[PDB]
Each structure stands twice: as structure tokens, then as C-alpha cells.
Design a protein around this nucleic acid. Structure first.
Ligand SMILES: [Mg+2]
Ligand SMILES: [Mg+2]
Ligand SMILES: [Mg+2]
Ligand SMILES: [Mg+2]
Ligand SMILES: [Mg+2]
Ligand SMILES: [Mg+2]
Ligand SMILES: [Mg+2]
Ligand SMILES: [Mg+2]
Length: 175
RNA sequence: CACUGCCCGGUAGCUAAAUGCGGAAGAGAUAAGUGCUGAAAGCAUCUAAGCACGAAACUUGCCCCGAGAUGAGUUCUCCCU
């Protein structure tokens, strides 16, 4: 609707190939591919991407409204990248990356090892910090959630793997 | 012959009180639940398109029966010239 009217201007240095509903986008950071819904039209006059409804579908401007913001993120990923910072709060909590494997120490009797997917590369500058980078926005959101899901941040001291941006609302251990 | 007359021991077999083993791990698709991206609805949103996770239940895996499975299947050999 009000999202699907506004065009996705695709900058130079970015290759865009339309194949029916399949849309590949190649750039210097990577290449990405998504099939659209059957309710969406897509076309291109050399600078802009426009997303129209195919006539006859009731969910026209919502399926075409989703398709704009998906491809608006595919362009940013192949030319800038999406980066997600994660920290650690607590005593003895520390991280370490070996190649593509985060090794966590989070208060358990066993070690914690994570296996980073095929487009995501991780970096611990600090033992209490993870910085991970990737082209696809949906995968850096999913990788960040699986690391936070080992010690979901405590409601008493904020303790555990949290996101960098968020506020963790704390509670007093009351009586 | 007297309850095997009354008793004392005891081979084999059968047995428990004797002594071996078992319930699983793993796989799949989920429940309640938890999320990721994301519009309708410029924001927000687990959901409408798409992606992940999740239980002694479910489907397997473990044991036995099983082609009268009339939908009566397969392989190997033998006999009758
Ligand atoms: Mg007599
Ligand atoms: Mg005896
Ligand atoms: Mg199992
Ligand atoms: Mg599952
Ligand atoms: Mg949104
Ligand atoms: Mg959200
Ligand atoms: Mg049990
Ligand atoms: Mg039942």
C-alpha cells in the first residue's frame, strides 16, 4: 500500500535479474534470491523497482507490500551488510570464535558450541561481546536469537546473553 | 502290612527365595509455548507470503507373530520328455 508505492531504487554496481517471480540480486557483498508470491508483479526501468498487484488476487497490496521491503533489504545486504552486536552480562561469562564456531561459557557444566550458517561470519573482539556480519537480514536475525536462547536475560540482574540495543527491565528481589 | 508305618539324607527333572538381561539413546512431524523476517495498518506486529525451535503423547527405532496380504508376493534348487 503506502509501502508498496515507494520505489526501491537499486544503485549502480548491483545486478538485478527478473525471471518470472524469481528475483536474483548480485552485488559485491553477495548474491541473494527469493521467489515472490503469485499476487505480485515486479518490473524495472533501469533505476527503480516497482511492485504491483496481479489483478484478481484479494491480497494484492499486502503481498506486494511485503515484497517491497524484502527486496529493499536484499539491496542493502549486497552493498552494505547487516551487523548484529550481542553482549554478555555476568561473572565468568565469556565467548570465543574459532573459524566459524562460537564457543560460549555461560554457567553450564558443559561447553556451548554454535555452528554459524553459510553466509554469517562471527567476531569476538571482547570476551563479553559478539559481532556478526551477513548479507541476508533474516539469517542474522535468526543467528542472534539462537545465541540469546542459551541464557535468556535474567529478570534479576540482566544476566545472560542479551542484545546490544535493548533495555532489560529488572526486578527487585523483594519480600 | 501299619499315611511312603514313622523318620534321616538325596540323583535327574521341575522350580524361587537363586542369577542373567530389559525399559533406552537416536530419527521425524508436532502440542501448549518461544522466536526470525514482514506487510495489510509509513509505526508496532511470531503470520497473512516465507524461515527456525519445542513433550514420557503421535510415527519410527527395540522384541514377537505375520502372504487366507483371495491384492494369496519373491528367490534358489529338484522331478516328470
Ligand atoms: Mg491286613
Ligand atoms: Mg537338597
Ligand atoms: Mg526422540
Ligand atoms: Mg521439530
Ligand atoms: Mg514493519
Ligand atoms: Mg520484532
Ligand atoms: Mg523414563
Ligand atoms: Mg493414544
Amino acid at each position: 500500500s503506502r509501502v508498496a508505492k515507494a520505489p526501491v531504487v537499486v544503485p549502480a554496481g548491483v545486478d538485478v535479474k527478473i525471471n518470472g517471480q524469481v528475483i536474483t540480486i548480485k552485488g559485491k557483498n553477495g548474491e541473494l534470491t527469493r521467489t515472490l508470491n503469485d499476487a505480485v508483479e515486479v518490473k524495472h526501468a533501469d533505476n527503480t523497482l516497482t511492485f504491483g498487484p496481479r489483478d484478481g488476487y484479494a491480497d494484492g497490496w499486502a503481498q506486494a507490500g511485503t515484497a517491497r521491503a524484502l527486496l529493499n533489504s536484499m539491496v542493502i545486504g549486497v552493498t552494505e551488510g547487516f551487523t548484529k552486536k550481542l553482549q554478555l552480562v555476568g561473572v565468568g561469562y565469556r565467548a570465543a570464535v574459532k573459524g566459524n564456531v562460537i564457543n560460549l561459557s555461560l554457567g553450564f557444566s558443559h561447553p556451548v558450541d554454535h555452528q554459524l550458517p553459510a553466509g554469517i561470519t562471527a567476531e569476538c573482539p571482547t570476551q563479553t561481546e559478539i559481532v556478526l556480519k551477513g548479507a541476508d537480514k533474516q539469517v542474522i536475525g535468526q543467528v542472534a536469537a539462537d545465541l540469546r536462547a542459551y541464557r535468556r536475560p535474567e529478570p534479576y540482574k540482566g544476566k545472560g546473553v542479551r542484545y546490544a540495543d535493548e533495555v532489560v527491565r529488572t526486578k527487585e528481589a523483594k519480600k
